Amino acid sequence: GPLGSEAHLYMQVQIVAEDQFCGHQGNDMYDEEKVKYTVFKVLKNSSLAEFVQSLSQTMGFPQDQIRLWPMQARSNGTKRPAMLDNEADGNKTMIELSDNENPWTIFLETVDPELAASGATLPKFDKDHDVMLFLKMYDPKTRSLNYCGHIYTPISCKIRDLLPVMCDRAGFIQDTSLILYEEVKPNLTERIQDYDVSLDKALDELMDGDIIVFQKDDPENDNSELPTAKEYFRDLYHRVDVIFCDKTIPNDPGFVVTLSNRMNYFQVAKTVAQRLNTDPMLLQFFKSQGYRDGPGNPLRHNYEGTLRDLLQFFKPRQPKKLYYQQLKMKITDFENRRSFKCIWLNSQFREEEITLYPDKHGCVRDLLEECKKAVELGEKASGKLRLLEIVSYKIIGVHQEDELLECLSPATSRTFRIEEIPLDQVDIDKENEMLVTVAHFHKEVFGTFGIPFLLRIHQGEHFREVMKRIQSLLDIQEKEFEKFKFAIVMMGRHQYINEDEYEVNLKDFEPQPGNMSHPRPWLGLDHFN
């Protein structure tokens, strides 16, 4: 709103008291958004000595019984209390001491009120030989930080001489072995390896407002998921909330899961599966799309990246969200299944469309048995299935059960038909019988149509026996059947068979001896549809 005429002469001073440090679970002393201050509107050019006296009066302590430690930013990104020399700077202005920072935050150290009632006085601080250190206790069992206050200590004090104070402030029995760290910055908790050296040597760049975090040295620490403070702070640094949604449930708001940015695929899958009460291998996940919300490409189960890689495209505004779905087979089998579309020719000689799901590494036999488990075979029939390949309404191949599915043509030209073998064809007499392919056409043999079939024929047979086999299979009226002409077709050359002279010689339907590749002769039926 309207700034007053002199507003440019005033700055905000935020005073934080030590009770604001208690309960903080993060790095540094407090969370900048949860911290409660005492706020002062102070002239920029008023003196530090003025402020110290006025504040002592306001907060209710004798001026000797308090000390100011400005909260100061460090190059590594942390914010820590720093020493302020009141006697030597008492005449400097507030804005020059604040380094033009506005608002300016200051930690106000006071004596404990009740303990001060005992006549206790704020000890004196030798700026040249003393350091103010802050203490935190890490409890692995509850996985929590417990604020343990601060201490004045000579730079020359040995780390080992500080262990009694840590034990006493944490409530540990004296001579409890301890592990000690410096909390340098988020994701850097450096263990202190030698307690028999001075603070100056144990800590690199020893300053006021440094932080030692300690914990019991206890076998039971290993029972916790975060046994050390180092791991606690690493986990804290890498924590991230992610919303998971089932992509097969429309407008699903999903549920939140707390994860770590450095989990691999398996850890993420483990966590989400435990909270869905399903097997981890029964889930499929999806990368993000980036710009537009909604699931993206499926995530291969052997993904080698981290959760951070999967989330890297969410801007600070967008809610982190991933998409999954639940499966009925293990993810490795789901990724490996091939959708094989084929025709099932039923016992009534009618086509049905069926999609089977064999493993992409399977053979023809796996496909045939997948289909057999799905259909209703003939009344009293062979109970054996065969797989044909049809192109332009002609049977061009019969595939043996050992061929790999990868060998079959994926071209959409090919129609693959599964059919029950008729009983006269399960085991033909190989010296006088033969299976020939039959296909319908009209005029030139180029124009094929209809349902082709395999037909058993016998040497020496009369051709009207062949026509009656054909007629019984085909199943139409005699008026249509009589019109049918018949031919033997080979390599674009066809000659017509005399229906009433009956010559059936296997040699006329055989390829050149030794040749199994050449498209074999076949029996062409001549009519119209």
Curated annotation (Swiss-Prot):
Keyword Zinc-finger: no
Induction: Up-regulated in regulatory T-cells (Treg). Down-regulated during neural progenitor cell differentiation.
Protein name (database record): Ubiquitin carboxyl-terminal hydrolase 7
Cellular component annotations (GO), alphabetically ordered: chromosome; cytosol; nuclear body; nucleoplasm; nucleus; PML body; protein-containing complex
Modified residues (Phosphoserine): 409
Top-level division of the source organism's lineage: Eukaryota
Keyword Ion transport: no
Subunit and interaction comment: Monomer. Homodimer. Part of a complex with DAXX, MDM2, RASSF1 and USP7. Part of a complex with DAXX, MDM2 and USP7. Interacts with MDM2; the interaction is independent of p53/TP53. Interacts with DAXX; the interaction is direct and independent of MDM2 and p53/TP53. Component of a complex composed of KMT2E/MLL5 (isoform 3), OGT (isoform 1) and USP7; the complex stabilizes KMT2E/MLL5, preventing KMT2E/MLL5 ubiquitination and proteasomal-mediated degradation. Interacts (via MATH domain) with KMT2E/MLL5 isoform 3. Interacts with OGT isoform 1. (Microbial infection) Isoform 1 and isoform 2 interact with herpesvirus 1 trans-acting transcriptional protein ICP0/VMW110. Binding to ICP0/VMW110 may modulate the substrate specificity or activity of USP7 to stabilize viral proteins.
Subcellular location: Nucleus; Cytoplasm; Nucleus, PML body; Chromosome
Covalent link (Glycyl lysine isopeptide (Lys-Gly) (interchain with G-Cter in SUMO2)) residue numbers: 315, 328
Associated disease: Hao-Fountain syndrome: An autosomal dominant neurodevelopmental disorder characterized by global developmental delay, varying degrees of intellectual disability, autism spectrum disorder, poor or absent speech, and mild facial dysmorphism. Most patients develop seizures. Additional variable features include hypotonia, hypogonadism in males, and ocular anomalies.
GO biological processes: DNA alkylation repair; monoubiquitinated protein deubiquitination; negative regulation of gene expression via chromosomal CpG island methylation; negative regulation of gluconeogenesis; negative regulation of NF-kappaB transcription factor activity; negative regulation of proteasomal ubiquitin-dependent protein catabolic process; negative regulation of TORC1 signaling; protein deubiquitination
GO molecular function: cysteine-type deubiquitinase activity; cysteine-type endopeptidase activity; deubiquitinase activity; K48-linked deubiquitinase activity; p53 binding
Region (Interaction with ICP0/VMW110): 68-247
Coiled-coil regions, chain positions: none
Positions bearing the Glycyl lysine isopeptide (Lys-Gly) (interchain with G-Cter in ubiquitin) cross-link: 315
Record's comment on post-translational modification: Isoform 1: Phosphorylated. Isoform 2: Not phosphorylated.
N6-acetyllysine, modified sites: 315
Alphabetized UniProt keyword annotations: Acetylation, Autism spectrum disorder, Biological rhythms, Chromosome, Cytoplasm, Developmental protein, Disease variant, DNA damage, DNA repair, Epilepsy, Host-virus interaction, Hydrolase, Intellectual disability, Isopeptide bond, Nucleus, Phosphoprotein, Protease, Thiol protease, Ubl conjugation, Ubl conjugation pathway
Chief localization: nucleus
Domain notes: The C-terminus plays a role in its oligomerization.
UniProt record similarity statement: Belongs to the peptidase C19 family.
Gene from which this protein is expressed: USP7
Tissue distribution: Expressed in neural progenitor cells (at protein level). Widely expressed. Overexpressed in prostate cancer.
Described purpose of this protein according to its UniProt entry: Hydrolase that deubiquitinates target proteins such as ARMC5, FOXO4, DEPTOR, KAT5, p53/TP53, MDM2, ERCC6, DNMT1, UHRF1, PTEN, KMT2E/MLL5 and DAXX. Together with DAXX, prevents MDM2 self-ubiquitination and enhances the E3 ligase activity of MDM2 towards p53/TP53, thereby promoting p53/TP53 ubiquitination and proteasomal degradation. Deubiquitinates p53/TP53, preventing degradation of p53/TP53, and enhances p53/TP53-dependent transcription regulation, cell growth repression and apoptosis.
